[PDB]
Design a protein around this ligand. Structure first.
Ligand SMILES: *[C@@H]1O[C@H](CO)[C@@H](O[C@@H]2O[C@H](CO)[C@@H](O)[C@H](O)[C@H]2NC(C)=O)[C@H](O)[C@H]1NC(C)=O
Ligand SMILES: *[C@@H]1O[C@H](CO)[C@@H](O[C@@H]2O[C@H](CO)[C@@H](O)[C@H](O)[C@H]2NC(C)=O)[C@H](O)[C@H]1NC(C)=O
Ligand SMILES: *[C@@H]1O[C@H](CO)[C@@H](O[C@@H]2O[C@H](CO)[C@@H](O)[C@H](O)[C@H]2NC(C)=O)[C@H](O)[C@H]1NC(C)=O
Ligand SMILES: *[C@@H]1O[C@H](CO)[C@@H](O[C@@H]2O[C@H](CO)[C@@H](O)[C@H](O)[C@H]2NC(C)=O)[C@H](O)[C@H]1NC(C)=O
Ligand SMILES: *[C@@H]1O[C@H](CO)[C@@H](O[C@@H]2O[C@H](CO)[C@@H](O)[C@H](O)[C@H]2NC(C)=O)[C@H](O)[C@H]1NC(C)=O
Ligand SMILES: *[C@@H]1O[C@H](CO)[C@@H](O[C@@H]2O[C@H](CO)[C@@H](O)[C@H](O)[C@H]2NC(C)=O)[C@H](O)[C@H]1NC(C)=O
Ligand SMILES: *[C@@H]1O[C@H](CO)[C@@H](O[C@@H]2O[C@H](CO)[C@@H](O)[C@H](O)[C@H]2NC(C)=O)[C@H](O)[C@H]1NC(C)=O
Ligand code: NAG
Ligand code: NAG
Ligand code: NAG
Ligand code: NAG
Lengths: 225, 318, 162, 31
């Protein structure tokens, strides 16, 4: 696992430095604000129906009662620009706060704890998560368990020995063509079937798919002592 | 999950077929350009929602030619190749129960088609359904691992506390309990149309907002007339610019009200889209040790079903 | 008829495409309207006929191009219309020019719509292909067949949230 | 004994009752 894990951390450091589009998630948030800030500032150059967009130009030309008519055109357009900005910022913040709740959730469940929920902490079975500080956000490094090599195995739901069905306490039944084995679901570790790894429930005439085999009993060889 | 993509042109909507009116619209600057970018971002996020929800895997999983369901009847949830479009018997009812747009899209607004067609969205569900029947719990977290479905319900009981010995003994009785549960859903959706109203409300919410924005063109907005050319004919060009300015300002408030709702309704859909992305992850792909997240009862395995502008979940519970 | 024109009928004016349909107005009703009270059809002041008014062709201009660092090739996309103005090809979203239709489907690159994605590939240009949903994987299934991992790989996935 | 584990004594836990726990090791020694 040392060669797998330590190389996986280096792949991310090589992916972030060489490829800059991986951070585009946060780059869009900064760009979404800049496009909202720039749009709000560019509105002061728009006349909004007024003769000019400069206050000093209107005040120096039209009468004070005449300027209030044109200044009314600017402020109405500038309020609609500012209210639209505040409207978006309240909506954009709701997007950020919703992601912050996921960031607060993953920080507890992925980073702090261990989440059994699949693909919440990312592809693979979650082990631990590593938080990293990022501008206007956070970057999570999730240690996951991904199975790689597999092989077709002969399985049975039950084992018939004395006339009663035997079921695995943990794991599943597999066979490599020689003897039936009890292995973990995520890892193949051939093990002799014994009464310690299985429990007796029902008989051989009920379960569909039960096969005949012999379960090792550790008490029998000790009878000679 | 997906909300109807609508791109409204503020050049045509504000000023219909008028260059001089468009000159008055240019006096307001980027307001037109900004409102277009807001509805464009919605159409992009709705396409991102379908990718972050409907497709949880990078491979297409299909059912083998020999179908062994372990006693259950999966013909309802699995697609039928005999139909011209690939969909399950349940999704066929989901398309019919969820249903003018042509007149409004000629008024200077555009309804954009989704990035993922219903046939492609159904293949995403077809890949998830065929996976859970074959690969089961493995394919969500990595490469697909073939497991017999008779054993795919054994560990799911071990996750909810039930010893898996109950499955193999009661598998014949569970075959009748599961198949009857699927049959009651088909009769519920076909006979009763209020079960899918959650999606119909989303379509009605958009159709009402679309109709609301279009009906505002007939309003006076304080102007003498609602027609740009009629004002130009009855009044002098300088006197018409005052009346036209009342229409433009009123029609911009119509867009600013529509765009505001769409941005808010999108966040409402994205809130449900993130749930659909989370539920498909926890419910469909894996097993949920949580209570009542996948619905009432101890969760076992979930069946996604493609639906117009959304998704339908079938949660097998204990 | 059947062209984009500026029409003035009696005291009514407008711009669109005139097409005679099977609709029948009441003899005392000259002008029709839609839900929005916008005229969808008229009756000629001279001859008696029912002419449906369809607005002139318009839509969005979608520019599909790779980044400035890649190439200057551009595929112009028109929305909800066939090819009118105008390697002129048609798609489901509308008239798409500048891109070449390819039967071979690859991974999606530039999103378009209706399950169509564009990319710059091979003497290279922009191609318009059907969006691929990923490699087809047929998993064998059997009562006694099972796949138990004999080896695993620890991969660190990077999730980025604001 | 395979379904149970020995922790503490009978004078602490409230609600403990007297019964006979089957021990599979006993019949194998005599037989
Ligand atoms: C399981 O897979 C891992 C790779 O994920 C194997 O590790 C490699 O083994 C080869 C053997 O020649 C080495 O050359 C590589 O350098 C190893 N890579 C890493 C990352 O360590 C491993 O041998 C496989 N077998 C087992 C039992 O784990
Ligand atoms: C399948 O598994 C069995 C049990 O582990 C293997 O049997 C062993 O094979 C090795 C190598 O030939 C022998 O040294 C052991 O003595 C065998 N053990 C027993 C008890 O048979 C078997 O080789 C594996 N492969 C096959 C062919 O099924
Ligand atoms: C497993 O063993 C059982 C017996 O314990 C087999 O069932 C017997 O089948 C024969 C016919 O082949 C009958 O005459 C016996 O009366 C049956 N005995 C019982 C207990 O019912 C069973 O067929 C064997 N299965 C396999 C696959 O070998
Ligand atoms: C699963 O249910 C379907 C329901 O269509 C069964 O298909 C048919 O069901 C009707 C009764 O509604 C029977 O009269 C037909 O003979 C069935 N077959 C066909 C080809 O229509 C189907 O048989 C059931 N079983 C499975 C495993 O699919
Ligand atoms: C057994 O393992 C193989 C490993 O590839 C699985 O894949 C099959 O491989 C055979 C090789 O001839 C192909 O003909 C099949 O089309 C492959 N199937 C798929 C869907 O990839 C195979 O599924 C496993 N099970 C069997 C039937 O042995
Ligand atoms: C699971 O077991 C069933 C029953 O043994 C298999 O179905 C048999 O397939 C064979 C070989 O083609 C036929 O001769 C039989 O008529 C089938 N019997 C039944 C009851 O259907 C099935 O093939 C096995 N698993 C899979 C998926 O192949
Ligand atoms: C179990 O039965 C005994 C009586 O046989 C109950 O009382 C115990 O009696 C013995 C003398 O026979 C005393 O030495 C003990 O101190 C008594 N108490 C206990 C708990 O040992 C005893 O209360 C019964 N326990 C239960 C929970 O049924
Ligand atoms: C008007 O004049 C035309 C000339 O062709 C004639 O055909 C029509 O009958 C007259 N009456 C109407 C209906 O306008
Ligand atoms: C364009 O991008 C490629 C790949 O990142 C890079 O190698 C090349 O130097 C870039 N060219 C320019 C002009 O930036
Ligand atoms: C486009 O062409 C198709 C197929 O001929 C036709 O059905 C459709 O009406 C055309 N649409 C337009 C906008 O011309
Ligand atoms: C696509 O298939 C059609 C119909 O067979 C054929 O006419 C055409 O040449 C093919 N085009 C490409 C790019 O392969």
């Amino acid at each position: 696992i040392a060669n797998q894990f330590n190389s996986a951390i280096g792949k991310i450091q090589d992916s972030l430095s060489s490829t800059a589009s991986a951070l585009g998630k946060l780059q869009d948030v900064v760009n979404q604000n800049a496009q909202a800030l720039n749009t709000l500032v560019k509105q002061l150059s728009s006349n909004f129906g007024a003769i000019s967009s400069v206050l000093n130009d209107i005040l120096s030309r039209l009468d004070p009662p005449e300027a209030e008519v044109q200044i009314d055109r600017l402020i109405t357009g500038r309020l609609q620009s500012l209210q639209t900005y505040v409207t978006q910022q309240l909506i954009r913040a709701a997007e950020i706060r919703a992601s912050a709740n996921l960031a607060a959730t993953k920080m507890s469940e992925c980073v702090l704890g261990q989440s059994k929920r699949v693909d919440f902490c990312g592809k693979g079975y979650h082990l631990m998560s590593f938080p990293q500080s990022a501008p206007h956000g956070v970057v999570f490094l999730h240690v996951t368990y991904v199975p790689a090599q597999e092989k077709n195995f002969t399985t049975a739901p039950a084992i018939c020995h004395d006339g009663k069905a035997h079921f695995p306490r943990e794991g599943v039944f597999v066979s490599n063509g020689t003897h039936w084995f009890v292995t973990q679901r995520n890892f193949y570790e051939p093990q002799i079937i014994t009464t310690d790894n299985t429990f007796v429930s029902g008989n051989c005439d009920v379960v569909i798919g039960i096969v005949n085999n012999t379960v090792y009993d550790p008490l029998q060889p000790e009878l000679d002592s | 999950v997906s909300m109807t993509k609508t791109s409204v042109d503020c050049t045509m909507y504000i000023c219909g077929d008028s260059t001089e009116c468009s000159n008055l619209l240019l006096q307001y600057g980027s307001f037109c350009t900004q409102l277009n970018r807001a509805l464009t971002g919605i159409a992009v996020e709705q396409d991102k929602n379908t990718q972050e929800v409907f497709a949880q895997v990078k491979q297409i999983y299909k059912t083998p030619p020999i179908k062994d369901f372990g006693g259950f009847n999966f013909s309802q949830i699995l697609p039928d190749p005999s139909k011209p479009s690939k969909r399950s018997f349940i999704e066929d009812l989901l398309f019919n129960k969820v249903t003018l747009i042509c007149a409004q899209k000629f008024n200077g607004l555009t309804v954009l088609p989704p990035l993922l067609t219903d046939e492609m969205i159904a293949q995403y569900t077809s890949a998830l359904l065929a996976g859970t029947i074959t690969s089961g719990w493995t394919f969500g977290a990595g490469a697909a691992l073939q497991i017999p479905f008779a054993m795919q319900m054994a560990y799911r009981f071990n996750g909810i506390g039930v010893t898996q010995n109950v499955l193999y003994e009661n598998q014949k009785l569970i075959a009748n309990q599961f198949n009857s549960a699927i049959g009651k859903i088909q009769d519920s959706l076909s006979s009763t149309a209020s079960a899918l109203g959650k999606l119909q409300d989303v379509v009605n919410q958009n159709a009402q907002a679309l109709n609301t924005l279009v009906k505002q063109l007939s309003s006076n907005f304080g102007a003498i007339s609602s027609v740009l050319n009629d004002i130009l004919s009855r009044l002098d060009p300088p006197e018409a610019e005052v009346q036209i300015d009342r229409l433009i300002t009123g029609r911009l408030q119509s867009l600013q009200t529509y765009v505001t709702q769409q941005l808010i309704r999108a966040a409402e859909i994205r809130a449900s889209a993130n749930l659909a992305a989370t539920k498909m992850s926890e419910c469909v792909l894996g097993q949920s040790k949580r209570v009542d997240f996948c619905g009432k009862g101890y969760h076992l395995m979930s069946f996604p079903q493609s639906a117009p502008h959304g998704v339908v979940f079938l949660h097998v519970t204990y | 008829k059947n062209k984009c024109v500026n029409f003035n009928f009696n005291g009514l004016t407008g711009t669109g495409v005139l097409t005679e349909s099977n609709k029948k107005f009441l003899p005392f009703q000259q002008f029709g309207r839609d839900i929005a009270d916008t005229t969808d059809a008229v009756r000629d002041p001279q001859t008696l006929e029912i002419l449906d008014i369809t607005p002139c062709s318009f839509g969005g201009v979608s520019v599909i191009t790779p980044g400035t660092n890649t190439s200057n090739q551009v595929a112009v996309l028109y929305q909800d219309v066939n090819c009118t103005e105008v390697n002129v090809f048609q798609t489901r979203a509308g008239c798409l020019i500048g891109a070449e239709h390819v039967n071979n489907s690859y991974e999606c690159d530039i999103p378009i719509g209706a399950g169509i994605c564009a990319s710059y590939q091979t003497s290279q240009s922009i191609i318009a292909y059907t969006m691929s949903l990923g490699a087809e994987n047929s998993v064998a299934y059997s009562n006694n067949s099972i796949a138990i991992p004999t080896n695993f790989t620890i991969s660190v996935t990077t999730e980025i949230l604001p």
